[PDB]
Scaffold this motif. Structure first.
Motif, mmCIF file in Angstrom:
data_model
loop_
_atom_site.group_PDB
_atom_site.id
_atom_site.type_symbol
_atom_site.label_atom_id
_atom_site.label_comp_id
_atom_site.label_asym_id
_atom_site.label_seq_id
_atom_site.Cartn_x
_atom_site.Cartn_y
_atom_site.Cartn_z
ATOM 1 N N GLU A 36 0.828 -1.203 0.000
ATOM 2 C CA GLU A 36 0.000 0.000 0.000
ATOM 3 C C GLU A 36 0.864 1.255 0.000
ATOM 4 O O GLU A 36 0.625 2.188 -0.775
ATOM 5 C CB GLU A 36 -0.939 -0.006 1.207
ATOM 6 C CG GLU A 36 -1.837 -1.230 1.294
ATOM 7 C CD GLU A 36 -2.553 -1.525 -0.011
ATOM 8 O OE1 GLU A 36 -3.174 -0.598 -0.570
ATOM 9 O OE2 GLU A 36 -2.488 -2.683 -0.478
ATOM 10 N N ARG A 70 1.112 2.396 -10.661
ATOM 11 C CA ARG A 70 0.416 2.230 -9.389
ATOM 12 C C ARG A 70 -1.090 2.377 -9.555
ATOM 13 O O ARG A 70 -1.862 1.663 -8.903
ATOM 14 C CB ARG A 70 0.954 3.233 -8.369
ATOM 15 C CG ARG A 70 2.404 2.976 -7.990
ATOM 16 C CD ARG A 70 2.977 4.090 -7.134
ATOM 17 N NE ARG A 70 4.308 3.753 -6.636
ATOM 18 C CZ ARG A 70 5.419 3.811 -7.364
ATOM 19 N NH1 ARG A 70 5.370 4.194 -8.634
ATOM 20 N NH2 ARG A 70 6.584 3.487 -6.821
ATOM 21 N N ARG A 90 -3.998 -0.391 -8.809
ATOM 22 C CA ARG A 90 -5.044 -0.054 -7.852
ATOM 23 C C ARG A 90 -6.429 -0.042 -8.486
ATOM 24 O O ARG A 90 -7.424 -0.252 -7.785
ATOM 25 C CB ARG A 90 -4.747 1.304 -7.210
ATOM 26 C CG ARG A 90 -3.523 1.294 -6.300
ATOM 27 C CD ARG A 90 -3.147 2.690 -5.816
ATOM 28 N NE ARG A 90 -4.167 3.265 -4.941
ATOM 29 C CZ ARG A 90 -3.987 4.343 -4.182
ATOM 30 N NH1 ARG A 90 -2.819 4.973 -4.177
ATOM 31 N NH2 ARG A 90 -4.977 4.790 -3.420
ATOM 32 N N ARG A 113 -5.459 -7.074 -4.026
ATOM 33 C CA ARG A 113 -4.013 -6.928 -4.096
ATOM 34 C C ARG A 113 -3.404 -7.467 -2.813
ATOM 35 O O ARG A 113 -3.937 -7.248 -1.721
ATOM 36 C CB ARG A 113 -3.602 -5.469 -4.329
ATOM 37 C CG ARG A 113 -3.776 -4.549 -3.134
ATOM 38 C CD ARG A 113 -3.413 -3.113 -3.497
ATOM 39 N NE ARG A 113 -4.428 -2.510 -4.359
ATOM 40 C CZ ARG A 113 -5.370 -1.665 -3.949
ATOM 41 N NH1 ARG A 113 -5.442 -1.293 -2.676
ATOM 42 N NH2 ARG A 113 -6.245 -1.185 -4.823
ATOM 43 N N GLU A 125 -11.401 2.735 -3.731
ATOM 44 C CA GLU A 125 -10.256 3.432 -4.309
ATOM 45 C C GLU A 125 -10.558 4.905 -4.549
ATOM 46 O O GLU A 125 -9.627 5.711 -4.645
ATOM 47 C CB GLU A 125 -9.844 2.750 -5.616
ATOM 48 C CG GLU A 125 -8.376 2.298 -5.719
ATOM 49 C CD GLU A 125 -7.744 1.919 -4.388
ATOM 50 O OE1 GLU A 125 -8.411 1.250 -3.568
ATOM 51 O OE2 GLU A 125 -6.581 2.305 -4.161
#
Length: 549
Positions: free
Chosen positions: A168, A188, A192, A198, A520
């Motif tokens: 993270e 990234r 994400r 993940r 997200e």
């Protein structure tokens, strides 16, 4: 069997291995597809063995979830434009995507992972309001980053950290709008936004106590105790949380279904096209739907042969046809999916209409054949009596009609006459009407007026027969029209039921997807990057738009 090449990169082209397809075609169980992806010589085969220049396959009984097959994939020889294709194929074919790299997550590790930044240019989720990449999280595999010979200590400001925490942190974005800041953020954001899960696992230096060519050769005693547990935790998670490979609609992927996906995706790459999930799901639909028709037909053919016997009524036959048609449609619905434009259901419906015609035609000739044998059987003695003057005499026509009525009653009283009884008898008598007329005109015991009256009685009797014959033809036409109406109704009934069940499943999938999209969105905003957060809110909105149509 053992490991074998599934896709080979020979002469710059990606070709399938026919023997590998042969093994898949025999795997009837649902498959959990775990793909270990990474550069050449990064220990990928070790993770393969512990869980058990193209893409290699090792199918093995799933160790922890019974009646499931574990399909282990390994991207061999990465590090050659197909290297990106190989990466993309591992994404589309796997249910868990283990990316394997040496060291830590730094600028070099993210550069090696540039393939993830190209998926938008090498993978199509659909064949078209919505951004294509916004659909990746709906079907992408779980993402797992395994870090081998990890050198960092898991600790921030004195307190311990987990491998997931390190991921993270390593996936957080850096502000700015220049070329560098975006190139730093692009990989990234892909990780994400594209993957629904993940995870991260680190591995220390194994401290191998023997010098061997393959780490698999070492005993537990000859390995760092820490490293052993980091492998145990990794295997336990992958084997316990990796989901069965599924297609949109909750369709569990098995050997043959996975085989179809390989063929479609690989032939799309070779044909200069882009691999597309939708095209691959439909391609499989063509095959299974085609089989659903044949399976439904087979059911229908055996339902009829078991219950059909000259029927007493046309309605009897039509009702049995609609019953077998109803059960046949159930088979097709239970074994079909993504029947674009109802083409296969229509194909089935036409084949079933034809079999009805066949049964009706055979029912008629069977009746005809049967009744024609009763004519010679019953009206044979009568035809002979007339040929030798049994009724050519005074008062003979009276005796003739009375014995003819006797034999007509015999013809009526035979059971198991088909629907052609009245038609075949009428045609016969109307062909023997000149023989009866001769006996009438030659009977010297009748006046000319009685002969004229008898002729008009027979004419009237024939006119009535022609009437009742027309009344029966039309009554059958109504039964035919009713059957046609009800059969069509049943098609609509079962297709709407299937569509309701399918739509519910689809909204559930969309509910799960948007929940991850929103998470997200919240996180991105909480760390700045209002633009990125906004981009997802539109992606979410478009998905919400898509569904109301």
């Amino acid at each position: 069997p053992g490991p074998m090449s599934l896709i080979d990169n020979t002469k710059g082209q990606l070709v399938v291995n026919p023997e590998a397809l042969k093994i898949l075609s025999a795997i009837t169980q649902p498959v959990v597809v775990v793909a270990i992806v990474g550069l050449y010589r990064t220990g990928k085969s070790y993770l393969m063995n512990k869980l058990a220049k193209g893409i290699w396959m090792w199918c093995v009984p799933h160790p922890k979830k019974p009646e499931h097959t574990l399909v282990l994939l390994d991207t061999e020889g990465l590090g050659n434009e197909n290297d990106s294709w190989i990466f993309a194929l591992a994404i589309l074919l796997s249910s868990t995507f283990v990316y394997n790299s040496m060291g830590t997550i730094n600028q070099q590790a993210m550069d090696q992972l540039h393939y993830v930044t190209e998926l938008t240019d090498r993978i199509k989720a659909n064949s078209s309001s919505v951004d294509d990449s916004a659909d990746f999280v709906s079907f992408f595999p779980a993402f797992v980053w395994t870090l081998r010979d990890f050198t960092l200590e898991l600790e921030v400001d004195g307190e311990p950290i987990t491998a997931d925490d390190y991921l993270e942190l390593s996936l957080k974005l850096r502000k700015g709008t220049d070329k560098k800041s975006k190139s730093f953020n692009d990989p990234r954001l892909c990780i994400r936004k594209f993957f629904p899960k993940r995870k991260c696992f680190v591995f220390d230096w194994p401290a191998p106590k023997k010098y061997l060519a393959h780490l698999e050769q070492l005993k537990e005693e000859e390995l760092n105790p820490d490293f052993i547990e980091q492998v145990a935790e990794f295997c336990s998670y992958i084997l316990s949380h990796s989901n069965v490979k599924t297609l949109s609609g909750g369709i569990p992927v098995n050997g043959p279904r996975l085989e179809s996906l390989v063929l479609t995706y690989v032939n799309a790459i070779s044909s200069g096209d882009l691999p597309c999930r939708e095209n691959a799901v439909l391609a499989l639909a063509q095959i299974e739907n085609s089989a659903a028709v044949e399976k439904a037909i087979a059911h229908y053919e055996q339902q009829m042969g078991q219950k059909v016997q000259p029927t007493e009524t046309l309605q009897e036959l039509l009702d049995l046809h609609r019953d077998s048609e109803r059960e046949a449609i159930e088979v097709f619905m239970k074994n079909s999916f993504k029947d674009v434009d109802q083409m296969f259901q229509r194909k089935l419906g036409a084949q079933l209409e034809a079999r009805r015609d066949d049964f009706c035609k055979q029912n008629s000739k069977a009746s005809s054949d049967c009744c024609m044998a009763l004519l010679q059987d019953i009206f044979g003695p009568l035809e002979e009596d007339v040929k030798q003057g049994t009724f050519s005499k005074p008062g003979g026509y009276r005796l003739f009609t009375q014995k003819l009525q006797e034999l007509k009653n015999k013809y009526y009283q035979v059971p198991r006459k088909g629907i052609q009884a009245k038609e075949v008898l009428k045609k016969y008598l109307e062909s023997k009407e000149d023989v009866a007329d001769a006996l009438l005109q030659t009977d010297q015991s009748l006046s000319e007026k009685e002969k004229a009256i008898e002729v008009e009685r027979i004419k009237a009797e024939s006119a009535e027969a022609a009437k009742k014959m027309l009344e029966e033809i039309q009554k059958k036409n109504e039964e035919m029209m009713e059957q046609k109406e009800k059969s069509y109704q049943e098609h609509v009934k079962q297709l709407t039921e299937k569509m309701e069940r399918d739509r519910a499943q689809l909204m559930a999938e969309q509910e799960k997807t948007l929940a991850l999209k929103l998470q997200e969105q919240e996180r991105l905003l909480k760390e700045g990057f209002e633009n990125e957060s906004k981009r997802l809110q539109k992606d979410i909105w478009d998905i919400q738009m898509r569904s109301k149509s």
